[PDB]
Structure formats: structure tokens, C-alpha cells
Amino acid sequence: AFKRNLEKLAELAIRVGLNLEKGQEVIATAPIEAVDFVRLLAEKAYREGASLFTVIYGDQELARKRLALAPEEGLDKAPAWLYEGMARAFREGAARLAVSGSDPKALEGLPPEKVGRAQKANARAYKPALEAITEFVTNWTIVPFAHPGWARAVFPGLPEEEAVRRLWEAIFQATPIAAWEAHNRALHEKVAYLNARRFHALHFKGPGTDLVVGLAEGHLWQGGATATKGGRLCNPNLPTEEVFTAPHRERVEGVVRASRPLALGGTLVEGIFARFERGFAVEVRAEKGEEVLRRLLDTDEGARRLGEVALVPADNPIAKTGLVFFDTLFDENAASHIAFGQAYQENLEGGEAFRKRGGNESLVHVDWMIGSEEMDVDGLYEDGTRTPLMRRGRWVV
Amino acid sequence: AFKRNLEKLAELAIRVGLNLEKGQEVIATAPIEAVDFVRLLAEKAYREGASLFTVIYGDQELARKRLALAPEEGLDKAPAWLYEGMARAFREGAARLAVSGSDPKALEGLPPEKVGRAQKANARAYKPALEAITEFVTNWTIVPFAHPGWARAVFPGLPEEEAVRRLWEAIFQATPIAAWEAHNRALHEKVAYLNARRFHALHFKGPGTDLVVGLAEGHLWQGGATATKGGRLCNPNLPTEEVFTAPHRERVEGVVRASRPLALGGTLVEGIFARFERGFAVEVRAEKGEEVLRRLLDTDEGARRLGEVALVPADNPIAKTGLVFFDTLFDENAASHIAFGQAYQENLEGGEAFRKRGGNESLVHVDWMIGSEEMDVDGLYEDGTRTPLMRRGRWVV
Ligand SMILES: [Zn+2]
Ligand SMILES: [Zn+2]
Ligand SMILES: [Zn+2]
Ligand SMILES: [Zn+2]
């Protein structure tokens, strides 16, 4: 009944997510608590040509016991060898699947001073891997399934057996081949429009919002299926409903107010609000967790500037459920969003000529949603003429 | 009650098996079906200084689905990157724990032609790792716990819930830091004795036995904790109760009769009996499976010669249980044993000068026990003077 779906999901993760070519290895990252799924995938991975399914499970309880028992000035250790190896594997042609779905409240009750000291070191070794993935070298994807740290957070509906029972079902909607085939087309179309009109800036307007997000010079809109070395499709993110590009470093004046909460690694930031001036967020605030957010955005200069503008129709699947998934992948594609920090260089058509064309450079990349069911969006040309792009959250084309 | 043991086991695996030094990473190999244990270990790993517990789970069902669905001429793939990485990690100082306990009958019902084609490739990439471990560079160990492929094979006692219930308990005997600390000393002592007295041969005598196992020239007795690149302890085998060295290729005259059965890869060889002449087993026989044993020992010349003499007091733990574990590791350390085939070169103090000093060379290494509760053992010098070593199975020192 539902097992017939779970299958399709998995089946899909491969024939579409990775578009796995016969005789291609498949390294996969996943949570030690979803083995049963891994296998389900593997099976389908191999049924498609996969020559080797290697999975590296990541247990949180393992790290949980680390932070609480490991010696300080000792956490600075990282699985360098592993990661640096995964890189090689990637560059040599190995595909990269990755199951996502973590429990935000796993590191709860633990000194945040340390947790950082540990992750700041992890990312330090993982870097060469990330690069291999950020810069599409191999075909990678990200499928997600339940987790008693999700069904337990999305729905606070006692039944854990049943929370998953619900959540597992939400994913069967948010995630067929013939609907996805006509979805990547429906995207590449908007992505074609937005690139051709060659706007000068977008203008969000709604309850409490009024932002003029300028756009970078020779900017370039991304969205949907990506090209893998020459001509080869593959949907990196499974939920994917967004379209985006880099705004302009110094051209975003206005006031913009949050729509959906922002799960910033455990702590919950709600009702956030920011005021922009000549591209700089001169005033960031929030009903809850103001302290935390302000710190992250005080990292460097670029911290308080924008590096990504994204349009997500609020009539989409992840949106119809109307829930908080405290997960980037899921929330990011929930509703139109804006993001502070570094702008993916994959958005500037075509180091120093970057900061000139309008690219923003920083350490952090925070995405918070602002799009909603009452968010109207127009697109302006350099002269001021404005073409309607979105209304009450829906596309007008 | 028993959880108080499981703890000690785990606790021990670290304070004695690895002798883990503070701030040392701990890579660990283990079966996806014994997570609960891994954690138990991890906890203790970190409670001891461990700065990072990284585990790589190995699921058999995963490989099971590979062989049966993966394309042929495609299995030749190996987790090169992973293994080659584990190597680096080892050479750089990372300890290496490894949980063992596999189900022999997991690859049952599958074409052996392929299974080989896959493992022959695995060992090909793993090699550099093995080398790092074979040649003690870091402190490594091997702890073992139940598995429904063991408790289901050791005891064919329906209750799987209870098979483990038994097996888990067998291990608590065969395998606590303060008892192991005074056990490795109690060994290194015998190992010191046996090396100093510099015998010319041992003489086993008992019911049906009368063998004069000469000893190799400049032989060297091994036993207990090993040295890892310079000065670093680590107990490779967890049950370990033996002490041994290489006999002399051409100097073992006598008649020796089996005490305990010999599990030779599935087939059960019982009551075996062999007659030696000038070092050659001129007559090997057995109540059951004679056919099988004779073949294995007819591989080459060295096949029917000895390459290891070991002394195991029959008043030991694995012995007090009085069971057949149809596992080398467990049986080998059950009671004094002798072994046909290749002699570990780690036993000759200090290629051609090997076959001269008395080293035996061959393809097979079969260990069958002969020691028992009524096995008296004396040790002879080159002149004939004999010093009593063991009586009724116990040491006399
Ligand atoms: Zn985005
Ligand atoms: Zn983003
Ligand atoms: Zn032995
Ligand atoms: Zn042996």
C-alpha cells in the first residue's frame, strides 16, 4: 500500500536524482537510524547498474557522547582521511547519494561553545569534499526520509510510530517520473524567462515587507536540473521547488519582514526582521534568538549583505503541508527566500572582478524565508518599468 | 546483572585491548547489526581519552544484494579510497578497534565463482591498510560480540533471542582491566622463561600421545601483548590464553592423538591421529572426515610438517566452559595445540636461511588441539636433561 510508494521514492532517488550511469560507484551519506532505507536504495541503486554501494552512517548519539565525555582541546579532531578520500572518489567518477533528515534537538542540552569548536573543525576537513560537490563534478543527490527527530518535531503529535506515519507521507507528496519530467521543464522555463528579461532588480511587497533587491551584473538564474560535465541531467535536491540568482552586493534598499521561522542549527529564530540600506542590513532583529542571529551576522562585512534571491510559489507541495521542517533542503524550497553571506559563484554568468560585478563574499550563508501567500513581486528594468512576476504568492509569468 | 559484564567487556576492549592513549582517534570496523555495542564501546573509548570514534559499518545484506543484482565484470570494484584512507589514518597515529562476529552462512546459496571475484578485489585495495595493521604501527585490537549468524550457528538451539543469550555469555568467559593487566604480565613471564631456557625440544606425553616436538634453531616464543612500531601494546586476540613458537621442520618424532575436534571450514574432523617421523607426518587419520583432512595436508610437502607449538593450560576460562566453538580464535586458545603448515616468521629470532634454521614453508596452516587435562609436558635440552613444564595440564613453571 504505502510500501509501494516508499519503493517509488527510492527507485526515483536513482533514475532521476542521480541519473546513475551503469558501472558507477555510489558513495552515500546517511543516518544510522535509517538503515532499512539505505538498503531499499542500494537495491535500486544496483538494479540500475550501480557497481558498488558504500554507505557511511552518521550517528548523532555517537557525537552526543563525544561532546559530553571527550576531553576539551581534543575535539579539534576531524575525519580528514575519510573526507579527503571521499573527494578523490568523487573526482574519479563516483556518484554521491546522501540521505537527509536530522533531529534539530539532538545537540540540545549541550554547551554550544564546544559544539561549534567541533563542527568548525569538521567543516575544515570536509571542505575538499564539499568543493567536489558544490562544483558539480559527479552526479549527486539528496533524498530524505523520516526520523524520530523529525516526525517528533514537525508534528508534536505524541504517536512517534505515527508521527513518522504522517511525515513519511508528506515526503511522498513533496518528492512520479512523468510529473517530475514536466516539472523540470516547468522550471527551466521560468529560469529561461528570468534570464532573458535581464532584470535590474526585483521588488517584494507585502504585509510588513518592502524590499528592492537589486540584482548582480550579468547575473544568472539557476533552477531545477543541473548539467554534469558536458550534457548530463541530475536533480541534486529532491524537494527542489526554487529558482534563484545572486542579488547585487551594494543595491538592496528596503525593509523586509520574516514569514517563516529560521532553524539556525538547533536554536529557533522567529519573526526576524531586517532593514537594508545601500545593500547593507543596518538593523537585524527578531522576536526570539536575536542574540544568536546578530552574532552569526557580525562575522564579517559580507555577513550582513545578500547573496541569493529565490522565488518559490507558495502554492507548492512543501507549502501546502504548512509545517516547519527545521531542515534547509525542505524549508529553503518552501517559499521564496533571501540569504545573507556568500553568493554561489554559479550565479554570475561567465576574484576581484567578482566584488565589482556585484558578487558578495563572506563566511556565512543563511537563508531565511520571506515569501508567503500574500507576497507580491514585480521585476524592474533599469528605467523603472515594472513587469509583474508574482501575485498573492503565485506566478503570473 | 549481565549488563554489568557487557560493560566490563567493552570497558576492557579499550583499557587493555587498545591501551588507548588520550587524544588518540579510534577508527573501528564493525557489523551494522551490533550498533548498540559500538556505542557502548565509543562511550568507554571517549571516557578514556578518545578524541574521536569513527565507525564504518559493514552490512552483509548489502553485499548479499550486490552479488545477486550487480552486473558481472562489474564486481571487480573496491572501496579503494576508503581503505587507502584508513591506512593514512593509521600511519598518522589513529588507533584501530574492530568488532568481529560474522555469520558464516550469509553468502550461502550464492555462486562462489562471483563471491571470490569480489573478495579477491576487496583484499586488493585493502592491502595497504592490512600492512599498516600486520606491521604494528598503531595500537589495534579485535573485540567480538554475538550475532544472529553466530548464536544461530554455534548453538542450533532454536531460541535466537536465547542463542545470543548463551553465546553472549560464552564471550564473557573467553574474554577486567586489572585482571588483564595481571594476565599479560603472567604471560610475558612464561614467554620470558621459555625464551631463556632455550630448549631443544618439548615432549608431550599423555593418553595415546608421545611426541617429541623439536624446536627451531634460535626459535623465539611469542605470547600475549604485542609491540606496535617501537613501543606500543595491544592485544590482537581477545580470548588469547596461548604461547607459542615454531617447531623444527625436520625434528618431530612420535605419535600424537587428538583431544578436541577440529572444525575445518564447515566439515567436522574428530579424533584425528597422526604419526611423525623425522618431522614428517607419515600417517594422518581420523574417525570422521579423514578424506577431507588428508587432502588439505596433501597440498605440498610442508603440508604434513609442523609450524607452531603452543602451550595452553587446561585450567583456563575457555577451557572451564568445556565447549566446541568451531572458531579458531576461541578453540586455538582452548588448549595446547600443534599446527601443520607454514610457521609464522615472527617466531624465528632475527628465505633460504629460513629452511635451514628449521622454518617450515607451506600454503596451509591447520591448528588442531592435543593438549588436555591429562597432558604432561617436559622440556628437553640438547643433552637430554629434562625440566618439567606442565603436569595434568597445569603449569609447574
Ligand atoms: Zn536556495
Ligand atoms: Zn541557499
Ligand atoms: Zn596457536
Ligand atoms: Zn595459529
XYZ file of C-alpha atoms and ligand atoms in Angstrom, chain B residues 242 244 308 310 332 337 367, ligand 3:
8
model
C 48.279 -19.199 24.369
C 53.933 -20.385 21.063
C 53.739 -23.975 15.524
C 51.594 -23.822 21.634
C 43.103 -22.221 19.443
C 47.994 -27.158 20.205
C 45.811 -25.884 14.106
Zn 48.201 -21.150 18.132
